[PDB]
């Protein structure tokens, strides 16, 4: 997170850190608890991941330094990629992790709420991008989960800022005209969360953008409302 500030234990109970164990263990992506066995993240996170055996989902983590070799983690039973995904910049950058074991809920780890498909009419005014990623191009993973507040921008203005790419309706953009606050390396797959009527909703999934916090170049996020039906098809399987 560029231009962001540190969070406190329990502030973003749905943010999780998604690790890979090969060749080394390393933080790979943000992700969001959406149910007692479901993590919503970005499909791009799994380029080069050939088996869910090498994934560790870590919840209730405020500091990356909390993780050591005996720390509990949730195994990933299954990876569900949207069948039309090919690139981040081409949309469909959504993915579900079905975990091997149930998640208990507490002040440190709690699910976040999907948008209601009848509430696209909503203009969110309190939105935050969160993650352990860089605050700086060519940096390192930040230790303490960072937060930054950013205004959503219209798809019209996001399109004007991104000639050459098609900004589909299933994408959503957010950033300050002058730059300075944005996600960056490591934050992808994390949430863009928005407080509405005292209820947090998972409005977007960090997915791509030109560099980081560059002025007149907002961040692009998978527009989560446009896939709610899709999510349910996978999470209500019979």
């Amino acid at each position: 997170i560029v231009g962001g500030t540190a969070s406190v234990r329990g502030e973003w109970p749905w943010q999780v850190t998604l690790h890979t164990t090969s060749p080394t263990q390393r933080h790979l992506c943000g992700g969001s608890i959406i149910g007692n066995q479901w993590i919503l993240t970005a499909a791009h996170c799994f380029y080069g991941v050939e088996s869910p055996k090498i994934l560790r989902v870590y919840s209730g983590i405020l500091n990356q330094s909390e993780i050591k070799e005996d720390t509990s983690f949730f195994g990933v039973q299954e990876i569900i990629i949207h069948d039309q995904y090919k690139m981040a910049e081409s949309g469909y950058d959504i993915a579900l992790l079905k975990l091997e074991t149930t998640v208990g809920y507490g002040d440190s780890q709690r699910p976040i709420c999907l948008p209601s498909k009848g509430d696209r009419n909503v203009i969110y005014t309190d939105c935050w991008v969160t993650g352990w990623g860089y605050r700086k191009l060519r940096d390192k993973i930040q230790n303490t989960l960072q937060k930054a507040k950013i205004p959503l921008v219209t798809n019209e203005e996001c399109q004007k800022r991104y000639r050459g790419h098609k900004i589909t309706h299933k994408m959503i953009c957010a950033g300050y005209r002058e730059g300075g606050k944005d996600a960056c390396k490591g934050d992808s797959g994390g949430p863009l969360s928005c407080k509405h009527n005292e209820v947090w909703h998972l409005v977007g999934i960090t997915s791509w953008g030109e560099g980081c916090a560059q002025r007149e170049r907002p961040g692009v996020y998978t527009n989560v409302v446009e896939y709610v039906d899709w999510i349910l098809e996978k999470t209500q399987a019979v």
Binding site: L28, D182, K185, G186, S188, S207, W208, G209, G211, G219
Partner: peptide, 10 residues
């Protein structure tokens, strides 16, 4: 970096 649009990924 290869793709300026993937600086916030990997």
């Amino acid at each position: 970096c290869v793709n300026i649009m993937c600086c916030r990924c990997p």
